Amino acid sequence: PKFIAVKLIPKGPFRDIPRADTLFGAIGNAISAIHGQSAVEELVDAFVGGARISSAFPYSGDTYYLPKPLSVEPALEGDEEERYTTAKRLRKAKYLDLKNFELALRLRPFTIPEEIPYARVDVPRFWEEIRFREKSGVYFLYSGPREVFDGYIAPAMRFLGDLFEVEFHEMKIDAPGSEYSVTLSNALPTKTPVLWRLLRKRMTFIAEGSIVKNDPGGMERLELEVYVYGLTFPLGVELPEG
Amino acid sequence: MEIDELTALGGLLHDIGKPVQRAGLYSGDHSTQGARFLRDLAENTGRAEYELLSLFSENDELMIRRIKELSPERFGLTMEDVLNALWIVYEADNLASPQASRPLYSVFNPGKAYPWAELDFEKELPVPGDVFSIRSQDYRELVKRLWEELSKAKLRSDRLLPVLEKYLTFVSSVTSEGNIISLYDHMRMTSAIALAMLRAGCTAEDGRCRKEKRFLLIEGDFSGIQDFIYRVSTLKYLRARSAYLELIGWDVVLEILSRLGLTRANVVFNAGGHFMIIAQNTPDAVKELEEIRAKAVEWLYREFESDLYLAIEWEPVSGREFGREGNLFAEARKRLKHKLTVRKLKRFGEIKGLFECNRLVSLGGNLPKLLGFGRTAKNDAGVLVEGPFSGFVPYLQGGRPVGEQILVKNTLNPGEIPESAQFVPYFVADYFKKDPKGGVATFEELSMASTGTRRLGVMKGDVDRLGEFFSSMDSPSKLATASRFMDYFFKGYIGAIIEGKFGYIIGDVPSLRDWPEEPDIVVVYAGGDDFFIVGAWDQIFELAFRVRRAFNAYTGGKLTLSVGLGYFDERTPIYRMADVVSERLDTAKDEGRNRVFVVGRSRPLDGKHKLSYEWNHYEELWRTYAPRIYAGNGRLKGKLESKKGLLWKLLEIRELYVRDPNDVRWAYLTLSDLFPELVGIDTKAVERKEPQPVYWVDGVLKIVLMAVR
């Protein structure tokens, strides 16, 4: 499917490579500052209506990175000493470039990014930041109606820019049709999922890369009114039998 | 006695005829000769049960008569049941499956072999060397010591195993060339398998049990171990968090054994938070496993949120699979490893609602004078900590043991504990530099004791390519030796290595100061092939080479370690240190293995320059340069007093190599007789596509300057 990618060109270092709950938070608060609570309510409606955003991922030059689907972890066996070393380094990798992501979805053989375009510098005093590489940045994907993108997501992102600037282009991901899909966002599942990593925030989130079977995720409102985004950004994924 | 305890002890003593034949005591074959030894032992001290266990060494004509003559009523055992026990134990022997003098050959290097000695963590390090015959005398001494211990033993698998472990650990269970299985391991694994068939209920078979999936391999593995131990708000505490994990795993393993009825012989291995158990495949058992797995996850999930998880799985297996046809056993494990990986990608999927400190401080504080812990009910006076299924009551020197089971530390001798208390030994690497107060030393104190700079030393270490090693094991008894020997290196001998033992074996290693009597070192965790140790940086730097060398010897030079070293400001938080040495460790494992991350460094990113050093590289480098510039005990050589900058100049010159390796200025740049190795341009290295000598030197210089400052 084709999606709007929103590139974040950073002016200076980052402290969060933000995931989708926080991106929605930021955009929700930004929408209220620009248009008032009614619009936030219109945004939540678009999102419950079908619109989705991913978590943010690194990019470098014209290379887009995506999260390794956990579907391949149980399938790596599909030399004796060559298999042992590689299996572990591939189990460790958190990202894949778009080309090898597409492969990993169809369970075909694929490779790992050699160098990844960011480094967590943790200077002592102690707290840390993310150093981006040259022409390197973070992006996230929007799927949904354009009028919602232009009407809410675009303006919000401009406002949040003023630590970065923003640009966005069409982006295509080829993905196998299947009963099973990866999440490109962190989600609050509705049903118990197939493969996952838990994320703790307090709230329990399925991680990016987890696999679900027809699970849209959900939103939650709370009183501290503020919405927390836990919707799933599904791409189809081929699973091994097991 | 009952049928279960008999069938346990039966498989356990089946092949006890071996050590008596080899001593030359009775003149039969080992089958004949083992019967007579127990029977003679039954007559001594009048415990007739041994004569009931003497039948395991031996058309069912005489056999039925000879059992009949012993009264089954006296032990309340059915005559038909006794025959079932004999045939069951007969089979167990085959599934876990000549000169008298041959020794046991090392599972790490089948070419070298073990000198007869008994298991003792104080006396000496087991080192496989040259093949010597073991005299008939030494087996005689063995068999007497053995006989005396069996006399006073209480006849419960938990009281038998420890005397068999002491004496029979270093005897070849079969006296053939390249035989690698410890007798003790074969015996427990025969007791293990035989009890599984009995709990299985198979009977009157002579492959229903053998070619039928009547067994259960159960692998239990914790995930989140280091997230649970480190990543805290103090070493005293950090030692209790590691101590607390060991009890939690025991609390589960024992409950599994308790509820399936099994004995500790069914525990193949239990280290590094990884356990395996052979069991029965009855629908009652899978139910009890399923009931237990959920309760442990619920309590573990409630106690530490998502921090620590217990993945448990089990594969139905048969007797075929316990051995090689055309390696099945490995294949039966591989399919279970898969179930186990998949389960780690479903953390806490046994909680449907998932999608809707002071005690440890006292425990760390009272950590020094305790002999063990009692596994009682949760609501019980004196319980200091609690695991999923049970409370744990610290058992002190003067005090009384409390509990159905008692867990005692670093000893195979029960000592004065009750007759009805199940004895469970556990070993742990618990060295610690004692402070002036009887308490363990602090990061601050440890960092003060260093030579030169006042840094805390940290090392994390791992054995390379262990999975491939443990997969190559053909049989249960082989896997049992492999794991027990491996675990005992870290849990048994790292303390020794720290105290300064095994000098002649270890040799000259890199070092900054004369090795102390009370070294400023504290083990955090060490066992099942991984370890985390802290102390005065220079003592930690040296202990890395001491441990790699001992380990090289302990194996046949056939297994290697990877280590990452860190030298931190004493104020640096614990979790950060873990993160950096972790990063440094799996950098060394990533640049090849068998290499050590000595100290952080600056290098060219031309993919031709490794941060790590192969051990023998760094060792040779230290042997070369350090004696020319360093005098020892935090003192530079006298010639270089008022020439200390010369060393700093070399570090700056290396930088110009780091700027660009290709620029030849560091040639331009170069008493001149000191460091001749760095002046020339290396030609073979250019051809080999390798770094210039200059690149490597900083690993020595930065360590010396650190000690000299």
Oligomer: heterodimer
Q: Can you tell me the overall shape of chain A? A: globular
Could you say how many structural domains of chain A there are in total? 2
- Integer-rounded radius of gyration of chain A: 18 Å
**What's the name of the CATH homologous superfamily of the domain at 443-618 in chain B?**
Reverse transcriptase/Diguanylate cyclase domain
Biggest β-sheet: strands ordered side by side in the sheet of chain B: 11-12-10-13-14-15
Proportion of beta-strand residues of chain B = 5-15%
The main pleated sheet of chain B reads as: 6 strands, mixed
PDB class: immune system
Keywords: Type III-A CRISPR-Cas system, Csm1-Csm4 subcomplex, immune system
Assembly: dimeric
Entry title: Crystal structure of Csm1-Csm4 subcomplex in the type III-A CRISPR-Csm interference complex
Detailed description of the structure:
The complex is a heterodimer of chains A (242) and B (709). Chain A is an alpha+beta fold and 242 residues long. Chain A folds into two domains: 184 residues, no CATH class; 40 residues, no CATH class. Helices cover 28% and strands 31% of the residues of chain A. Chain A is built from five helices and 16 strands. In chain A, strands 1, 2, 3, 4, 5, 8 and 9 form a seven-stranded antiparallel beta sheet that branches. A three-stranded antiparallel beta sheet of chain A has the order 13-10-16, with no helix packed on it. In chain A, α1 runs antiparallel to α2 and α1 packs across α5. With 709 residues, chain B is of the alpha+beta class. Chain B has a domain of 176 residues: Alpha-Beta Plaits (2-Layer Sandwich), CATH 3.30.70. Chain B has a six-stranded mixed beta sheet, with helices on both faces. In chain B, strands 6-7-5-8-9 form a five-stranded mixed beta sheet. Chain B has a four-stranded antiparallel beta sheet with strand order 2-3-1-4, sandwiched between helices. In chain B, a hairpin with a 4-residue loop joins β6 and β7. Chain B is globular. Chain B starts with a helix and ends with a helix. Classes of the chains: A alpha+beta (242), B alpha+beta (709). At the A-B interface, α3 of A face α13 of B.
